């Protein structure tokens, strides 16, 4: 065998990525042998060979990449080079193209066959469905193929644009929401598409101190992991009462241990069941979703719908990993989403002016303070922004909050204050 280590991973019940690579290699080589226009027939086999050596060595064989892009864009293509250049020349250049997904990864066969045809012609035949951010990954191509691949994507009957990379607005993503989910508090897919479209320039042409990510979740269940994986997490919610179908609850009560599986599990004890009537103190409810999750036929999100915005979510780098925290307790999500757009724009202006090289929004807020951040987005401080008031008396006071005094005059006179 040419690949004894990777062959081990063709064994076992779970579908094999090695099989995916080999299948690509065989059929790309066959396609080129039949005279089909395929520029990179050996790309997938080259990848396999490199990966086998990497399994033998227990290390990567990719080096720091030179910076590359398609004409007019500064992002969406990642340069990647193999330190096994001479030995495996077919993967010396092996770049990734990030392709913007439809909202909620919904496809038709026609849309997908288009992508398959372009990538077969110009790339390795290897893809990721999907990249962690949400993009379709075109895994492995040369520099001179990037532009004509892009031209073809744009000319498809169902055309696909490049996603984001570098210091830009990344490709937004969204949960299925109102497509399949009865929990939906807003149209996630529509919001996602609208933002992607409104801020095409921000996405294609990186201009910021670092990357910025937006993700849209239909309800608190947070099915796109927005609060950990996006800088700006838009999570559906409501303001009024949970709707309760009483007869439906009774149907559940005949078989479900509602006391133990629902009542006792509510973080705030807002939900009660006596055998006849279900009761919810919506003043005490924190919209955690559990009770609704438990009884979808009986329980529903209220009518006054919108989103809570969580700011700061990120991976560790520099200052520590972040689950986003409350920036805006409630905002309406209605086309054309002017309220959400005003927030974003204000944040970007400020971040571009004040941010350091490679400083994420979360780190900027930590450095500049919540006060500055709130006045930037033009919002008031709210107790719902904290799990608890500060545990120390070390407060900043603004000049205008101080009583006039001989001392304040002294500060004024010195030129400080």
């Amino acid at each position: 065998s040419e690949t004894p280590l990777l062959d081990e991973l063709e064994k076992g019940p779970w579908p094999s990525f090695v099989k995916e690579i080999k299948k690509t290699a065989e059929l790309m080589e066959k396609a080129a042998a039949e005279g089909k226009d395929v520029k990179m027939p050996k790309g997938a086999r080259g990848l396999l060979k490199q990966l086998e050596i990497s399994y033998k060595d227990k290390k990567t064989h990719w080096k720091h990449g030179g910076i590359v892009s398609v004409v007019g864009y500064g992002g969406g293509v990642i340069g990647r080079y193999s330190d096994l250049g001479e030995q495996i020349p077919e993967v010396e250049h092996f770049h990734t193209m990030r392709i913007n997904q439809p909202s909620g990864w919904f496809y038709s066969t026609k849309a997908l066959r288009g992508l398959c045809d372009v990538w077969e012609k110009w790339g390795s035949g290897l893809t990721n469905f999907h990249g962690s951010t949400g993009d379709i990954i075109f895994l492995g191509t040369r520099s001179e193929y990037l532009q004509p691949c892009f031209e073809d994507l744009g000319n498809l009957e169902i055309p696909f644009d490049i996603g984001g990379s570098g210091s830009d607005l990344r490709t937004p993503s969204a949960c299925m929401g109102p497509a399949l989910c009865e929990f939906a508090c807003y149209d996630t897919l529509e919001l996602c598409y609208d933002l992607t479209m409104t801020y095409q320039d921000e996405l294609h042409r990186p201009m910021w101190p670092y990357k910025f990510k937006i993700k849209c979740a239909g309800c608190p269940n947070d099915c796109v992991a927005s609060k950990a994986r996006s800088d700006f997490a838009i999570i559906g919610t409501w303001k009024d009462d949970i709707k309760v179908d009483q007869e439906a609850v009774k149907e559940y009560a005949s078989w479900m241990d509602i006391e133990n599986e629902v009542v006792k599990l509510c973080p705030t004890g807002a939900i009660k069941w006596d055998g006849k009537e279900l009761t919810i103190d919506n003043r005490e409810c924190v919209r955690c979703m559990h009770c609704i999750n438990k009884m979808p036929k009986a329980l529903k999100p209220g009518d006054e719908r919108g989103a809570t915005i969580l700011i700061g979510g990120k991976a560790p780098f520099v200052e520590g990993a972040v689950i986003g925290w409350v920036a805006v307790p409630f905002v309406e999500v209605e086309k054309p989403y002017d309220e959400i757009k005003e927030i974003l724009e204000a944040i970007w202006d400020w971040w571009d002016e004040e941010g350091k090289f490679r400083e994420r929004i979360g780190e900027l807020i930590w450095r500049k303070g919540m006060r500055e951040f709130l006045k930037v987005i033009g919002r008031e401080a709210d107790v719902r922004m904290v799990k608890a008031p500060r545990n120390n008396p070390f407060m900043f006071f603004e000049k205008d909050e101080l009583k006039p005094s001989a001392y304040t005059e002294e500060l004024k006179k010195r030129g400080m204050w």
Binding site: W62, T109, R113, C116, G125, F129, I158, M289, K387
Partner: protein, 363 residues
Amino acid sequence: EGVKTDFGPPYFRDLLHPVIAKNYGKWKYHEVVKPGVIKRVAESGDVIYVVRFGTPRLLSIYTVRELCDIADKYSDGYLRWTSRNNVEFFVTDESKIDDLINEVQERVGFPCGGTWDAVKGEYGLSNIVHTQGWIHCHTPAIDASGIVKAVMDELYEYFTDHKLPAMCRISLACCANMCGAVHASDIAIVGIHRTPPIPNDEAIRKTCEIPSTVAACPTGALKPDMKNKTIKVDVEKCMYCGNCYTMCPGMPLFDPENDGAAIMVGGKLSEARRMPELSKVVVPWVPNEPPRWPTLVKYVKQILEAWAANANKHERLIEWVDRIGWERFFELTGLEFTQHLIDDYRITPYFYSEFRASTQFKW
């Protein structure tokens, strides 16, 4: 003509299945049929069956074409992927439900499952979210696709059933840069280095943005030597994150023998029952063992099965811990608490612990 730009991805609404398009935002209730199969009901009174399958993420376009060939005579030409790299299908006539599950198994070798029913209280395992590893990445300590395959082999049956008390998510990252939901998953595998970087002065002067390489060290182990014109590393302060290598090709901290993965545990995203949580390291280091990563797989199973055994209905891992305490957690999982597990990462501020990292509040 030229080359057209700034047009974006296709409008999703045109890529919707008729019934899904019709009943948009107008659904009544969902019902999990079996494992892998969710029935969906709309106010109108129309029924569609979502059928979910596990995918290796990395896909041949020929596997995609073959997914399309399936999609036509089962789901009227439409399909989706999920946030966890699973491919879903939308089936109407439901006598035909089960040979679907079969032809998929016959053609692409993707197994139906990855679902859960909160209602009864029976959860199965879903796909592992991950990155590139040695397939495409230049900073990795471990290999995603590989470890994923190995773990998912030992954890197949769970994914294909609802053999679980509660919901459990597993995630993988290839380095400390930590791509994916690894910082907040019930179980997480994180590529770590245990070795300082030896400066390559030879290429630091040709490449590398020097003062920004120095600025991108979290513990301050880097001092910009001006002599000489290089970077000197105070080994006392290096915790081997590998971030300096992301900034500079002349800082390889790669030691194949000492690079491995940590296992962290007890992260939450959903707000249900309790507030979301970041994952915590409970195993400091397991070795890189291509091809099957036994030591890693062993500890993941050990941990998964221990919580599985003891947890109440809907009691996720962080929730279990709330009940038993960490004292009893280590005892039950058979793991050893060492000094490595005491946090010492200085730069993160205490005040973040006071911020509401969650939608759970009162109006």
